[PDB]
Amino acid sequence: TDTTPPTITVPSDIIAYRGEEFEFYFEITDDSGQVKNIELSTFGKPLGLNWLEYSEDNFNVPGNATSDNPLRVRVHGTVPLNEPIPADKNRAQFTRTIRAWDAAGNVSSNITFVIKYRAQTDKYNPADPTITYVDRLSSLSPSEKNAVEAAVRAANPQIPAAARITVSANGTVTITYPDSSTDTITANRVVKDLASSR
Amino acid sequence: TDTTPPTITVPSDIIAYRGEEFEFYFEITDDSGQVKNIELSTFGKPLGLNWLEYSEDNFNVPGNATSDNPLRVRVHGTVPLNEPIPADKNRAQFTRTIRAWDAAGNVSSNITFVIKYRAQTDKYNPADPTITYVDRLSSLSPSEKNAVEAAVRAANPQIPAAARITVSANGTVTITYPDSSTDTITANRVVKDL
Numbered sequence: 001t002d003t004t005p006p007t008i009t010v011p012s013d014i015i016a017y018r019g020e021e022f023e024f025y026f027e028i029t030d031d032s033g034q035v036k037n038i039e040l041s042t043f044g045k046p047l048g049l050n051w052l053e054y055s056e057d058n059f060n061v062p063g064n065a066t067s068d069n070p071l072r073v074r075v076h077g078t079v080p081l082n083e084p085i086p087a088d089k090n091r092a093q094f095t096r097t098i099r100a101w102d103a104a105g106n107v108s109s110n111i112t113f114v115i116k117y118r119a120q121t122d123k124y125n126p127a128d129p130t131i132t133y134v135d136r137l138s139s140l141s142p143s144e145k146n147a148v149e150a151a152v153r154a155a156n157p158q159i160p161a162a163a164r165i166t167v168s169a170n171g172t173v174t175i176t177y178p179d180s181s182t183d184t185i186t187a188n189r190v191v192k193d194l195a196s197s198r
Numbered sequence: 199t200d201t202t203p204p205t206i207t208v209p210s211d212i213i214a215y216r217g218e219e220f221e222f223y224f225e226i227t228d229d230s231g232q233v234k235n236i237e238l239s240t241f242g243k244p245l246g247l248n249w250l251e252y253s254e255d256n257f258n259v260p261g262n263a264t265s266d267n268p269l270r271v272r273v274h275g276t277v278p279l280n281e282p283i284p285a286d287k288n289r290a291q292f293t294r295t296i297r298a299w300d301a302a303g304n305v306s307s308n309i310t311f312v313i314k315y316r317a318q319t320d321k322y323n324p325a326d327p328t329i330t331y332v333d334r335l336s337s338l339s340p341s342e343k344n345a346v347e348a349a350v351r352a353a354n355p356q357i358p359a360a361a362r363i364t365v366s367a368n369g370t371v372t373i374t375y376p377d378s379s380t381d382t383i384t385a386n387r388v389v390k391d392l
């Protein structure tokens with residue numbers, strides 16, 4: 001008789017960026033070769049993360065969970081754009097637990113996984129734009145600000161389209177990601193005097 | 199015999215906007231059907247408008263200035279982008295004179311014309327953008343601002359490409375034209391609660 005519960009393999013470095021879809025996989029096997037279902041929890045309490053999702057595809061099918069072909073459970077979601085990140089950046093995580101049943105009613109003991117989440121600017125590193133030559137460095141014209149925003153946008157296609165690029169009177173660039181975290185580019189790397197570069 | 203000066207017809211409403219090229223036409227006619235040349239001046243003195251230019255095409259040719267086909271002098275230019283604008287718009291203008299003469303040497307009197315100039319916002323009237331909903335009216339997100347600018351821009355292709363559209367925390371829209379004059383769109387015609 002089967003008295004042995006399923007065995008679960010967890011990903012070791014799950015990192016998510018606010019507002020951006022992420023995914024990761026659990027791998028599960030059982031000596032019977034069949035896994036019935038799983039439970040995501042907070043150590044036996046409600047999961048408490050309605051944005052976390054996973055497919056029950058191929059659950060409880062003979063052969064779905066062998067050593068050669070493990071049950072691969074795809075977990076995905078989006079950490080909310082405005083999920084709180086406290087002063088200590090490393091507190092930004094959720095520790096949760098997973099267990100699985102086999103077809104014989106053996107349930108594994110909860111093991112932990114940790115979902116770390118960070119601000120979008122941690123993901124993004126803006127390349128400097130091609131220099132925009134201006135008439136007065138301490139007072140850019142509207143067309144000069146537009147050229148800057150265009151140049152920055154052009155130099156960083158990997159940056160999200162929903163990120164907003166602003167430009168100050170002296171050409172300082174602020175890039176504000178959808179989660180309101182920011183990057184900055186100093187004026188002396190964005191604009192130069194036209195008449196001097198003659 | 200020709201002892202009669204040519205007749206000059208000036209445009210009644212010449213209105214230019216800073217930084218933007220304008221054009222207008224004088225129409226000139228003479229008995230003889232020929233106009234020799236014209237002169238633009240400040241009531242006889244130098245014109246003092248180096249940014250103004252006019253075409254001397256077909257001057258002093260027989261039949262260039264008849265009542266059926268008058269001499270049409272094309273005038274064009276650009277009023278300087280930073281031309282000072284008096285609080286009293288009545289002084290926001292250049293008053294000048296034109297005279298013309300025929301091949302007989304009959305010179306017309308100095309006829310007045312006036313080039314009024316204005317800030318770029320006097321020309322542009324932005325249409326309302328497609329309404330954009332936001333999660334919080336008093337505090338728009340980066341994405342919601344991006345969509346606002348895009349919506350304003352979309353509904354106003356007439357605005358110069360060089361103009362800059364900014365959006366504030368509450369969705370108030372500011373359009374700043376190349377001459378640094380501005381238009382404003384209030385949040386009521388821009389944003390709403392989702």
Ligand SMILES: CO[C@@H]1O[C@H](CO)[C@H](O)[C@H](O[C@]2(C(=O)O)C[C@H](O)[C@@H](NC(=O)CO)[C@H]([C@H](O)[C@H](O)CO)O2)[C@H]1O
Binds near residue numbers: 042084086090096
């Ligand atoms: C209830 O006690 C929990 O015990 C767990 C044992 O591993 C954890 O220590 C847990 O702490 C964290 C976590 O999930 O790891 C620590 C995080 O810094 C904290 N996150 C934040 O404050 C912001 O993301 C989380 C959350 O408070 C919690 O997971 C949400 O339910 O708790 C202990 O809370």
Ligand SMILES: [Ca+2]
Binds near residue numbers: 003005102
């Ligand atoms: Ca088993």
Ligand SMILES: [Ca+2]
Binds near residue numbers: 121182
């Ligand atoms: Ca960054």
Ligand SMILES: [Ca+2]
Binds near residue numbers: 149165347363
């Ligand atoms: Ca913009």
Ligand SMILES: [Ca+2]
Binds near residue numbers: 200202228300302304
């Ligand atoms: Ca005549």
Ligand SMILES: [Ca+2]
């Ligand atoms: Ca020519």
Ligand SMILES: [Ca+2]
Binds near residue numbers: 319322324381
């Ligand atoms: Ca206007």
Ligand SMILES: [Ca+2]
Binds near residue numbers: 320321
């Ligand atoms: Ca007007």
Ligand code: NA
Binds near residue numbers: 261262267268
């Ligand atoms: Na003609």
